[PDB]
Amino acid sequence: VHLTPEEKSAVTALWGKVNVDEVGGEALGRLLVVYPWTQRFFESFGDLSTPDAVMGNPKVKAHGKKVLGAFSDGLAHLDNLKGTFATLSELHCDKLHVDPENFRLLGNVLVCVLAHHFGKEFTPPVQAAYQKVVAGVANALAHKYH
Amino acid sequence: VHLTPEEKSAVTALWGKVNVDEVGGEALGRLLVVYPWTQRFFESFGDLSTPDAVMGNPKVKAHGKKVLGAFSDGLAHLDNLKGTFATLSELHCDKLHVDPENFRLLGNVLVCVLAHHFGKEFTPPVQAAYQKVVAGVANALAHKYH
Amino acid sequence: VHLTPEEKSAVTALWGKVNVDEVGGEALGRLLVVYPWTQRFFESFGDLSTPDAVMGNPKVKAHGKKVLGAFSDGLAHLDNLKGTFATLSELHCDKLHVDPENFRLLGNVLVCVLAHHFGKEFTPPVQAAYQKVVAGVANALAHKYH
Amino acid sequence: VHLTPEEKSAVTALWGKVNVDEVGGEALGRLLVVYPWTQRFFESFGDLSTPDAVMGNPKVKAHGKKVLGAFSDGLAHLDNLKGTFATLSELHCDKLHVDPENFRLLGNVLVCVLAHHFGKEFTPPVQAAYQKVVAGVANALAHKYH
Numbered sequence: 184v185h186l187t188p189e190e191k192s193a194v195t196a197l198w199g200k201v202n203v204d205e206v207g208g209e210a211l212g213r214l215l216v217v218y219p220w221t222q223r224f225f226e227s228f229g230d231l232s233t234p235d236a237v238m239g240n241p242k243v244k245a246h247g248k249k250v251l252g253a254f255s256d257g258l259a260h261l262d263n264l265k266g267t268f269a270t271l272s273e274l275h276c277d278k279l280h281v282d283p284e285n286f287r288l289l290g291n292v293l294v295c296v297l298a299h300h301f302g303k304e305f306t307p308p309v310q311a312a313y314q315k316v317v318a319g320v321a322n323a324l325a326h327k328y329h
Numbered sequence: 330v331h332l333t334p335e336e337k338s339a340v341t342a343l344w345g346k347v348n349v350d351e352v353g354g355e356a357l358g359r360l361l362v363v364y365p366w367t368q369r370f371f372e373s374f375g376d377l378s379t380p381d382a383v384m385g386n387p388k389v390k391a392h393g394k395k396v397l398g399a400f401s402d403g404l405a406h407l408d409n410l411k412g413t414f415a416t417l418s419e420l421h422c423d424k425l426h427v428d429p430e431n432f433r434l435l436g437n438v439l440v441c442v443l444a445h446h447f448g449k450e451f452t453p454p455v456q457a458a459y460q461k462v463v464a465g466v467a468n469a470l471a472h473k474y475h
Numbered sequence: 476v477h478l479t480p481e482e483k484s485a486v487t488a489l490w491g492k493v494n495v496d497e498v499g500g501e502a503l504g505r506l507l508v509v510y511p512w513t514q515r516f517f518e519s520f521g522d523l524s525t526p527d528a529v530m531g532n533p534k535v536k537a538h539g540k541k542v543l544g545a546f547s548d549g550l551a552h553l554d555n556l557k558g559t560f561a562t563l564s565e566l567h568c569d570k571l572h573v574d575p576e577n578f579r580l581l582g583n584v585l586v587c588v589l590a591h592h593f594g595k596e597f598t599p600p601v602q603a604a605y606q607k608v609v610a611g612v613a614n615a616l617a618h619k620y621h
Numbered sequence: 622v623h624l625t626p627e628e629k630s631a632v633t634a635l636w637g638k639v640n641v642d643e644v645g646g647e648a649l650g651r652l653l654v655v656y657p658w659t660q661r662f663f664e665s666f667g668d669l670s671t672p673d674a675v676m677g678n679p680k681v682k683a684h685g686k687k688v689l690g691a692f693s694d695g696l697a698h699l700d701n702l703k704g705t706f707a708t709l710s711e712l713h714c715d716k717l718h719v720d721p722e723n724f725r726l727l728g729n730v731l732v733c734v735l736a737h738h739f740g741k742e743f744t745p746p747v748q749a750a751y752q753k754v755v756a757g758v759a760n761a762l763a764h765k766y767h
């Protein structure tokens with residue numbers, strides 16, 4: 184990832200204020216609603232049969248928080264997303280066999296939640312910069328396939 | 330495209346409240362900022378060298394109006410998108426050689442721009458519903474390649 | 476999916492010399508080797524942990540003959556792709572939750588397999604028409620998500 | 622790009638047998654036939670309106686060789702794809718505005734062309750490795766957008 188210094192400062196000025204509970208629940212719930220094939224990764228979590236069921240689901244909510252913590256770390260290490268994510272790459276690729284496309288799609292969902300939460304401060308350039316971050320994190324997650 | 334009763338009703342309702350003059354222009358502007366290669370189709374519109382020149386460009390705006398009204402037509406014809414866009418497919422495909430992937434990408438941008446503006450009313454099932462709509466429109470635009 | 480009368484004759488002609496006991500299994504196996512996440516759909520098939528294991532697996536080859544028969548059904552009914560895949564789309568989407576991207580991949584794998592077996596008569600236009608046919612197939616298999 | 626010592630050994634021996642004057646022209650040509658939107662980048666090239674026009678265009682073959690040669694540079698330096706391609710990445714991204722997806726599609730075409738000229742030597746593992754390699758090159762060409 185390269186961010187312009189104007190992009191960079193903005194991107195992290197905004198992350199400072201992110202509610203991980205709201206953003207994490209919204210992001211992961213919306214993945215499973217918008218892209219329902221993804222549910223077959225979380226059969227364990229229980230009831231995922233409707234949007235209310237997915238969104239209220241406490242394990243869905245709790246796992247989104249953890250997902251966001253990882254992105255929080257990606258953020259604090261944009262120079263080496265590939266090392267930051269090396270072990271998560273091994274988990275999702277070697278063991279979970281998550282399709283790399285789903286990494287992209289969660290990324291894109293995360294972006295549209297942030298437009299939803301960053302409000303007026305979510306300008307075209309701030310949007311461009313977060314799309315780069317979640318694309319780099321996606322590529323880094325899929326690294327054990329490459 | 331298949332939508333359920335809930336979905337369609339909230340779809341059109343949210344769509345009722347969209348500004349005709351502003352949204353297409355913000356989505357078309359955002360596409361060219363986030364995905365800067367798409368600028369190659371619009372160089373005759375003027376200066377696209379910075380985010381500010383893309384977003385403020387009057388042709389980008391004015392053209393975005395036509396883009397938004399095309400989607401509007403699509404919403405009115407979800408039954409027959411392929412027939413609805415047959416003429417715009419010839420234009421984009423045979424004459425302008427727009428990559429199918431760019432159609433997809435504008436739809437995703439239009440989805441974030443809705444999420445940005447309608448915050449809480451852009452529920453997960455309404456996002457799912459707009460995702461299905463824009464991808465349908467993208468497919469029908471790409472019909473000439475197929 | 477549009478082919479010219481030139482296109483379909485070339486395509487059907489070539490299709491006639493496709494070894495139906497092996498091309499299917501070759502494409503399924505190459506899918507499984509080339510994009511190893513797809514293996515999560517077939518864990519009841521026995522040993523898949525080496526290229527050799529995969530390519531030898533009798534249930535890969537058994538299955539591929541069935542895959543190949545469904546592409547022949549597709550090739551016969553290009554004006555009725557959606558309808559022709561209605562039942563498989565129910566299976567693959569509502570029962571098996573296969574990601575749509577994987578339908579596209581298998582298609583592309585089937586393309587390189589044909590090229591691998593034919594040469595002489597696998598002209599640039601036949602390759603283009605087969606890509607179209609397989610993209611039509613994948614889009615029909617994903618119908619239930621649309 | 623990681624390759625296994627067997628993949629690397631096999632991949633290099635195959636590339637040893639590639640006609641550097643022809644395979645790259647066949648790739649670029651088939652790209653232009655199969656995914657005909659890519660024709661719009663080649664503004665110098667004259668007539669691209671039929672498959673013969675694309676495949677025998679002198680500039681298609683001459684440019685094809687340059688492309689092939691750059692792929693050799695990558696296959697030689699698999700630990701150093703970002704560096705090997707930095708200058709091409711500027712060109713393609715900043716100056717020419719080539720969509721990443723198209724870098725990927727050119728890769729996939731090349732893979733099939735190889736499949737087309739090699740037969741059983743083109744094992745499932747060798748296909749897998751080339752797909753890795755070509756995706757690596759696509760990602761290093763798109764570096765300036767990231």
Ligand code: HEM
Nearest residue numbers: 221224225249250253254279281285286289290320321324
């Ligand atoms: C793209 C960004 C993503 C990030 C940053 C991320 C992050 C994480 C983290 C931090 C864990 C917890 C691992 C542990 O310590 O044990 C995890 C687990 C998991 N992730 Fe992801 N993930 C991502 C995408 C995906 C996607 C797209 C899927 C599936 C569609 C997925 C499926 C899973 C599953 C199934 C688990 C195991 C959860 C469990 O413990 O039950 N992840 N992920």
Ligand code: HEM
Nearest residue numbers: 367370371395396399400425427431432435436466467470
């Ligand atoms: C996916 C939804 C899209 C819709 C609904 C749409 C709709 C339209 C409409 C209505 C026109 C004008 C018809 C006329 O006035 O003669 C048009 C023109 C055009 N569109 Fe699109 N379009 C879409 C996507 C794209 C994309 C992704 C690109 C390029 C990145 C693109 C590039 C163009 C260009 C270059 C023109 C001609 C503009 C001019 O010179 O006046 N469109 N589109």
Ligand code: HEM
Nearest residue numbers: 513516517541542545546571573577578579581582612613
């Ligand atoms: C793209 C073209 C595809 C075609 C034409 C196709 C065709 C078929 C057919 C005809 C069946 C029914 C078999 C039977 O009743 O015995 C089937 C089953 C199945 N397909 Fe597909 N398929 C395709 C893609 C995929 C992909 C991409 C996946 C996963 C990566 C997949 C996974 C399965 C599975 C898991 C079954 C059930 C397997 C079993 O229990 O034997 N298919 N497919």
Ligand code: HEM
Nearest residue numbers: 659662663665687688691692717719723724727728759762
């Ligand atoms: C993905 C692998 C690719 C490689 C290895 C590659 C390599 C190169 C090379 C070596 C050059 C010439 C550098 C020079 O002579 O100054 C070049 C120029 C170019 N490439 Fe690519 N390229 C790739 C993909 C693409 C794609 C997908 C497109 C468009 C669809 C594209 C469009 C061009 C254009 C328009 C030029 C300039 C042509 C000219 O000089 O007239 N390339 N590429």
